[PDB]
Amino acid sequence: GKGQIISNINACVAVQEALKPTLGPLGSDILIVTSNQKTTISNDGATILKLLDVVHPAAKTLVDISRAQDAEVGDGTTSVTILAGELMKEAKPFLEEGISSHLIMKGYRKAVSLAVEKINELAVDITSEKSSGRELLERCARTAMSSKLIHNNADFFVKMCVDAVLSLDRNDLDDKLIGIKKIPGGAMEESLFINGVAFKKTFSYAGFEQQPKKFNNPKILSLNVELELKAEKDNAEVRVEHVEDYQAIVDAEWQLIFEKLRQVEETGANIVLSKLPIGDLATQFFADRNIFCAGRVSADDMNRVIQAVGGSIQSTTSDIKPEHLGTCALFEEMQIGSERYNLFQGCPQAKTCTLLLRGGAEQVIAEVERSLHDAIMIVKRALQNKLIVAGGGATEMEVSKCLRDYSKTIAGKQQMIINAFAKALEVIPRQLCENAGFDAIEILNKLRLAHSKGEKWYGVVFETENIGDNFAKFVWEPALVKINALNSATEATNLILSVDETITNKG
Amino acid sequence: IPLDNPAAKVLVNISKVQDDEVGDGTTSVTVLSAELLREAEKLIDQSKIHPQTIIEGYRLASAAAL
């Protein structure tokens, strides 16, 4: 009956309430404690909903639709749930009045169909008009970096961010291809950009002062087995009773390891990397041959080495082929932060890069690293899609405006339903002002003043509270996000309103 | 005697110093230390100030006693 429908309304509001403070770059962050007892803090709606694992069917629908928003698009996972859940509150008083939810869901199909048509009209394709090649991507990075602690140092940060995208093919871009390694301690403005891949360098064992940071053309080869002979698991027991035989029964094992020398020595690989920690056995002979070795390397950073110089992983040292080797242009190692950092530079075949970040504390860089990810998506989608729309409240207000005029010509219950859907579009700009500190009541009244003057581009300024146009604020958003957000929010809402009774079997 | 009081476990470790260093008058140390707590309890509840100031007064009084 209608009792379970009302219970599904509050279930969507409870999930929406957690994602309200996380909307926007200046929004608040949520703290969720996983069963693994690991602290996870993120403002992105995808990761938030994936860690909740809610048993409620309607609340899980908002979680499942967030994965579809992150798959086909990857941006707007927080706003798609807030918009989908807002329809549950607007349709709550309509159920008590006798209006069925089926006519409410029917009005959304006609409202979204007319809204998508208005998105293409607001999207203007511009590339070389009033813009250059270098200054195009630089002005987009300063938008997401505004109202942040890095705003003073953002001059040096944009130059390193643009070079990360240009270092890869503009046809295929991925945010996972750009790596970031946090460096505790040091000045923020002293960070540099690296063309190759780097790792954390957790190797604490001795044999330092050699393998200098200056290399010419080192050869890279992947390693599988362990170089050390120490057996961690198995063992053996053999004992003799002869007194004079105690001499040589302590002696010879490592001579068997010499069998793997000539195979590796004739290869000439100057870089030794593996997914297992390198032992304490030989740190020297490699340095005599100008061969470098680094142990305790994570498995995630080993896959980037294969895509860099074109290496390969072989189990033994016998069948290793000579053409699997690769070399970089230059090597660099920095001791800043009381820790050595190994990084490769000048790899022409590298499909990945690494950007180092420095700061006062580790928690300070965590806010800088995540604030950069929002700027990378704006720079990445600029070259991929040439159709962009004005964001920051601009597009969200006009989509709700056109539905008010078109509803006047429509007769029946669909008039108040489209007007309710248009009113439901005001939750997106609301939380953006409340999370940024601005009063949502005063802006909502003042923004609708110039919004009726015939200009559809008026947005909301995120720096200083005021009404105006985001065109001067350099706030750009792609058209694929606004189109897929209305379809994903409506489809997820139609499935919840179409289920009157919830049945859960235990077993 | 097993003592569940975490404050009483410290007194046991303190009394072991007198046995190892000398080993005479171990009981007299605990009796005299218990009387110091009786006077210190009346000084706190009537003050509620950190006892470290009162501790400094014991060092000046112990020098005159020696």
């Binding site: 957690a18 403070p21 608040s28 962050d29 949520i30 703290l31 969720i32 404690v33 996983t34 602290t39 602690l149 505790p184 301690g185 604490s204 064992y205 001795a206 044999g207 330092f208 002062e209 050390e228 120490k230 057996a231 053996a236 053999v238 105690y246 001499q247 040589a248 029964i249 302590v250 002696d251 010879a252 094992e253 490592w254 010499f258 032992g279 304490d280 056995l281 030989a282 020297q284 002979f285 005599d288 800043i336 932060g337 009381s338 820790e339 006062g360 504390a361 928690q363 999370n435 940024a436 500190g437 | 975490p6 476990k9 410290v10 470790n13 100030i49 950190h50 470290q52 100031t53 400094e56």
Partner: protein
């Protein structure tokens, strides 16, 4: 679950009750606590890092104090109790603004702008160390550990431990980067002996009994050979399960070091050649062996040469006190890249208290070299920063006008806490420090927790690092923001 109503009120009360535990332990007069380990050992110390690390609790707000305190020991180490008390002051002042309708992010952003303006105020009133004199800088290093150790029995021998930290930091830290590595500082101590036998060693200790007693206690020069060469082998030296003697003399390795043990008849071959062997060595101890002596790890006897092998002064055995372990000393005589802290004591608790106090003493030396400009602490820095922000609050209009007033009143918590922990009227003392810095002249006069001759610590040459105090106020604002930025609490159950 609480959002937008009882969340802001509960986070302030939860963080205040936890921070109120260590408020009484702040300063040299602060009171200790009795901690009980799960193994049955009782630990008593005045360091806030030990107390906060032993806390196991499910409260999501108090977990930020443990994660932040881990990075404070490496960077500074003195920001354990001070930052937590200062962070609680910003939360108490923010609670009154929530009821007045002030947005929480404006409170978070208000403390950031107030902290940046207060740093520039101390830049004008700070004084120079090296510009005053060279030997006055060393006098600060000698009395650096005296303040923290003045409340302990160690304060009698403190003059001996003062010269140990002066030469240890110069070797590990270069004037270019001016950084000290924690992994290069070997802290080792044992039970027994006294604190007067502690010596400053330029290299790894590596306690060894020299295996069979026939081996000599000293390493021969081997016909004027250069230094003493060592060999580190972690290979499982063992029988032949499913040549070398001729290549050993070519390299000239004097001693062999291994992670595991040896047989009795195995060391008899190297005994006639005067080549001692070392067994039973931990994995972490091998790090300081090659770095201090500039040695290497032998890949093999065939390809090993004499060029890159390290050379030290000598290796001899020196008994320490009445301990029957018969430890040894390995010296260098040349500047190394690492040092080894040697601490002894007659009690297990005295050793643990002396090792942690030396850790904070080594970080102060790094801060004095990295930043020559310093300010006078002990309550004088917080009062000076209070009058600077409160005076500029009237010149700055808008919402940030009240954010500067609450930030100035929050800085007064530390000198009042030091006044409460000193057994004096916190309000009556705070009004005195503000009156001396205005009508008379601008100076630094702090609250004395320990009994001294008079006020004006500048006469007593009591100095604190400015960058050390600057790192504390930055972590306090960073911690206060992360608390206000979390309006929700979500936790699962226990099955």
């Amino acid at each position: 679950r609480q959002h937008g109503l009882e969340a802001k009120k509960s986070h302030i009360l939860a963080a205040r009750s936890v921070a109120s535990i260590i408020k009484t332990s702040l300063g040299p007069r602060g009171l200790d606590k009795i901690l009980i380990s799960p193994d049955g050992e009782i630990t008593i110390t005045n360091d806030g890092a030990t107390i906060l690390s032993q806390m196991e609790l499910d409260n999501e707000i108090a977990k930020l104090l443990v994660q932040l305190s881990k990075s404070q020991d490496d960077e500074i180490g003195d920001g354990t109790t001070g930052v937590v008390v200062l962070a609680s002051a910003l939360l108490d002042q923010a609670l009154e603004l929530i009821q007045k309708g002030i947005h929480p992010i404006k409170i978070a952003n208000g403390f950031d702008e107030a902290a940046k303006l207060a740093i520039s105020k101390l830049e004008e009133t700070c004084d120079d160390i090296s510009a005053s004199n060279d030997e006055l800088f060393r006098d600060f290093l000698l009395r650096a550990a005296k303040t923290s150790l003045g409340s302990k029995i160690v304060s009698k021998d403190h003059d001996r431990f003062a010269e140990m930290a002066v030469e240890a930091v110069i070797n590990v830290m270069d004037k270019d980067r001016k950084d000290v590595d924690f992994d290069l500082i070997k802290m080792q101590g044992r039970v027994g002996g006294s604190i007067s036998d502690s010596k400053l060693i330029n290299g790894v200790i590596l306690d060894k009994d020299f295996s069979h007693p026939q081996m000599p206690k000293c390493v021969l020069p081997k016909e004027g050979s250069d230094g003493v060469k060592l060999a580190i082998l972690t290979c499982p030296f063992e029988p032949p399960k499913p040549e070398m003697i001729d290549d050993v003399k070519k390299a000239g390795a004097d001693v062999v070091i291994c992670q595991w043990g040896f047989d009795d008849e195995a060391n008899h071959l190297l005994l006639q050649n005067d080549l001692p062997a070392v067994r039973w060595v931990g994995g972490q101890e091998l790090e300081h062996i090659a770095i201090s002596t500039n040695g290497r790890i032998v890949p093999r006897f065939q390809d090993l040469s004499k060029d890159k092998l390290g050379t030290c002064s000598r290796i001899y055995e020196q008994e320490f006190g009445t301990t029957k372990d018969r430890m040894l000393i390995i010296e260098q005589s040349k500047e190394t890249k690492t040092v080894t802290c040697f601490v002894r004591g007659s009690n297990k608790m005295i050793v643990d208290e002396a090792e942690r106090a030396l850790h904070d003493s080594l970080c102060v030396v790094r801060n004095l070299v990295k930043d020559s400009r310093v300010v006078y602490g002990g309550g004088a820095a917080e009062v000076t920063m209070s009058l600077a922000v409160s005076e500029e609050a009237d010149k700055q209009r808008g919402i940030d006008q009240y954010a500067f007033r609450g930030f100035a009143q929050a800085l007064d918590t530390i000198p009042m806490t030091l006044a409460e922990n000193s057994g004096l009227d916190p309000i009556g003392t705070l009004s005195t420090l503000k009156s001396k810095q205005l009508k008379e002249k601008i100076s630094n006069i702090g609250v004395d927790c320990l009994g001294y001759g008079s006020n004006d610590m500048k006469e007593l040459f009591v100095v604190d690092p400015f960058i050390g105090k600057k790192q504390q106020i930055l972590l306090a604002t960073q911690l206060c923001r992360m608390i206000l930025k979390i309006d929700n609490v979500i936790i699962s159950g226990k099955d």
